[PDB]
Structure 1
Amino acid sequence: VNSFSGYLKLTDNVYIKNADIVEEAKKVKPTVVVNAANVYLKHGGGVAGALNKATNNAMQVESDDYIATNGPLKVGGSCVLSGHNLAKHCLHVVGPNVNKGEDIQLLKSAYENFNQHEVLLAPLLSAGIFGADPIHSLRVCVDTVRTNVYLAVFDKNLYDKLVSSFL
């Protein structure tokens, strides 16, 4: 049994809810929240900008030190950093950004990072300002992630479409 509430069950291991991932993280304090990161961990807008704002910029400060030491992530890659006031840990995962021309096949590699964590609160990778089709992102998630994932879809309209169209 876990703390996650109000989710629709899609599969054995994937659950979905219309929710602000920031508000959900603040309520649950999950072991792992996933960030929709870029390779530079520049948390400007989208899920990343919202998570970082909720940490009062401490996520960005920590991320800048990580990059100064390690250099940029790979598209499809990840790193584990603090969850600050939102979670124990933040798994920063880089999905391909279609608005930069990145290979959508890297979306499966991105989701494979989730399998290193038993339970996660996450957004749909490469959705929103990363430009991918969220229906496709949900299909890749279900077909890739084997650990227990609780997905947070910001838009109510999109949430309803993801559920209605789910095979």
Structure 2
Amino acid sequence: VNSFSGYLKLTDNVYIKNADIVEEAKKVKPTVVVNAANVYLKHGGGVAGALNKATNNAMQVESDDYIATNGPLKVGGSCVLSGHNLAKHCLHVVGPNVNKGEDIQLLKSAYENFNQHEVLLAPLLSAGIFGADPIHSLRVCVDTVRTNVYLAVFDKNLYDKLVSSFL
């Protein structure tokens, strides 16, 4: 048993809810929250901007030190940093950004990072301002992630479309 509430079960391991991931993280304090990161860990907008704002910019301060030491992530890659006030850990995962012309085949590689963690609270990778089709992102998630993933979908309209179109 875990503390996640109100989720619809899609598969053995994947769960979904219409929720603000920031508010969900604050309530649950999961072991791992996933950030929709870019390779520079510049948390300006989308899910990353919202998570970073909720940490009072401490996520960005930690991230800048990480980049100064290690250099940028790979598209499809990840790093584990603090979860600050939201979670124990934040898994910063870089899905391909269609609005920058990145290979959508890298979305599967991105989701493979989730398999290193037994339970995660996550957004749909490459959705929102990253420009991918969220229906596609959910299919790749279900067909790639084997650990237990709790997906938060901010937009109620999109949530209902994801559920009603799910195969």
TM-score tier (shorter)? over 0.9
SS in 2 for 1:27: helix
Residue 143 of structure 1: how far off its partner (Å)? 0.0
Residue 67 of structure 1: how far off its partner (Å)? 0.0
**Root-mean-square deviation over aligned CA pairs:** 0.1
Residue 60 of structure 1: how far off its partner (Å)? 0.0
SS in 2 for 1:23: helix
Cα deviations across residues 72-117 of structure 1 (Å, max 9, x unaligned)? Answer: 0000000000000000000000000000000000000000000000
Instruction: Provide the rounded CA distance (Å) in 1 between the counterparts of 2:16 and 2:103.
Output: 26
Residue 153 of structure 1: how far off its partner (Å)? 0.3
Instruction: Provide the rounded CA distance (Å) in 2 between the counterparts of 1:84 and 1:151.
Output: 20
Residue 129 of structure 1: how far off its partner (Å)? 0.0
The two structures have a TM-score, normalised by structure 1, of: 1.00
Instruction: Provide the rounded CA distance (Å) in 2 between the counterparts of 1:79 and 1:40.
Output: 12
Instruction: Provide the rounded CA distance (Å) in 1 between the counterparts of 2:33 and 2:113.
Output: 13
SS in 2 for 1:47: helix
For the pair 1:64 / 2:94, whether they are aligned, the reply is: no
Instruction: Provide the rounded CA distance (Å) in 1 between the counterparts of 2:50 and 2:159.
Output: 19
Instruction: Provide the rounded CA distance (Å) in 2 between the counterparts of 1:58 and 1:103.
Output: 31
In structure 1, runs of 5+ residues without a counterpart are none
The two structures have a TM-score, normalised by structure 2, of: 1.00
Q: Which runs of 4+ in 1 moved over 4 A?
A: none
Among the aligned pairs, what percent are the same residue? 100
Q: How does 1:22-41 map to 2 (within 5 A)?
A: 22-41=22-41
Residue 18 of structure 1: how far off its partner (Å)? 0.0
